[PDB]
């Protein structure tokens, strides 16, 4: 499935942030962003594909200092080419989520959530 | 070499609190993460929170955010826990341990020869 | 409800000297990282009256100083200690440790003794 290739990839970079000691970045610093709430549904996937160009910014930036994070860019590729067809086919619509503050690692783990809800449904 | 030296037992009343040491010999205490885990008899082994020595961050499991607190000090080559608000299931064996590598958080080796607490009703 | 599950069979066990020994540990999750192509698991060993210490790590490596009788094998969700020509210095509990997403978890442990 593709959400369930979306799910992998995002427990997978939450596992190397967990794992990799100098992946410091995105462990301890909180940033604004789109959060899932109880809403679910895959249009709500805009929010999180508007939140990647940030987010290569922060492994690019991780990477600069650590040099374990060398495969970051078709990381961000795999996740916006797999976001952009779970979302549909519609105008895109503009995150009507609620702004919120967290790392990205608690970022992960609640999109992460987000996307087990969905498996339960289907 | 690596050694980890953990203070002796404690006896602690319910809501109270403990305060436990972990010296480090043979190696700098900088250079590795120092991992916490607890073992109770009849609950197995159990990850308690990891903190890294040379900047102090810390990671805790849910479970332990409110009740510990990580901490070491670079001057003494030692880390510390302390929970608070005991209660008789806090009664355990507290190991600290070493990260394997530099690199890499987990896994957790050269275990310390475990601090004895027990939280009586 | 979020943690990574650990189960671990069997949970007691006795066997004679020079028999071979397994214990199994399943996952709820999937240990293996893509990208490093390696599975999150170790296996721990608790001599009575002693700390536990790391016998295996990354699910097949194991320790320097660990006999070659313990072999850890296996991928993705299914896990396997294998003790062969198992010595009465054997006699411990042993462990299986997860640690692909924190927090990392335990499985509940297989208590091993020995026989003549």
């Known amino acids: 499935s593709h959400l369930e290739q979306l799910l992998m990839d995002l427990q997978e970079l939450l596992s190397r942030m967990e794992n990799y000691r100098n992946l410091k970045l995105p462990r301890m610093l909180t940033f604004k962003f789109y959060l899932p709430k109880q809403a679910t549904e895959l249009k709500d996937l805009q929010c999180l594909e508007d939140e990647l160009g940030p987010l290569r910014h922060v492994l690019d930036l991780t990477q600069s200092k650590s040099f374990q994070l060398e495969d970051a860019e078709n990381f961000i590729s795999n996740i916006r080419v797999t976001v952009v067809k779970l979302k549909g086919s519609d105008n895109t619509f503009e995150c009507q989520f609620d702004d919120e503050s967290a790392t990205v690692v608690d970022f992960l783990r609640r999109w992460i959530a987000f996307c087990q809800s969905i498996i339960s449904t289907s | 070499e690596i050694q980890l030296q953990q203070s002796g037992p404690e006896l602690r009343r319910p809501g109270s609190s403990v305060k436990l040491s972990c010296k480090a010999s043979?190696?700098?205490?900088?250079?590795?993460?120092i991992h916490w885990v607890r073992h109770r008899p009849e609950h197995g082994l159990e990850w308690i929170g990891w903190?890294?020595?040379?900047?102090?961050?810390?990671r805790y499991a849910q479970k332990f955010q409110s009740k510990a607190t990580l901490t070491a000090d670079t001057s003494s080559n030692a880390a510390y826990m302390q929970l608070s608000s005991l209660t008789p299931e806090d009664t355990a064996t507290y190991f600290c341990?070493?990260?394997?590598?530099?690199?890499?958080?987990?896994?957790?080796?050269?275990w310390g020869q475990g601090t004895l607490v027990t939280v009586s009703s | 409800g979020s943690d990574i599950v650990m189960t671990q069979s069997p949970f007691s066990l006795a066997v004679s000297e020079g028999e071979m020994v397994t214990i199994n540990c399943k996952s709820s999750?999937?240990?293996?990282?893509?990208?490093?192509?390696?599975?999150?698991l170790a296996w721990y060993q608790q001599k009575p009256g002693q700390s536990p210490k790391l016998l295996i790590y990354?699910?097949?490596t194991g320790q320097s100083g660990v006999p070659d009788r313990f072999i850890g094998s296996g991928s993705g969700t299914d896990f396997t200690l294998t003790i062969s020509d198992v010595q009465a210095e054997d006699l411990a509990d042993y462990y299986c440790?997860?640690?692909?997403?924190?927090?990392?978890?335990f499985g509940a442990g297989t208590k091993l003794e020995l026989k003549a």
């Open positions: 341990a070493r990260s394997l590598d530099s690199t890499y958080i987990y896994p957790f080796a050269y």
């Open positions: 043979g190696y700098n205490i900088t250079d590795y993460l």
């Open positions: 903190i890294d020595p040379e900047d102090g961050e810390t």
């Open positions: 999750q999937s240990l293996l990282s893509s990208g490093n192509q390696k599975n999150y």
């Open positions: 990354y699910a097949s």
């Open positions: 440790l997860q640690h692909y997403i924190s927090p990392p978890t």
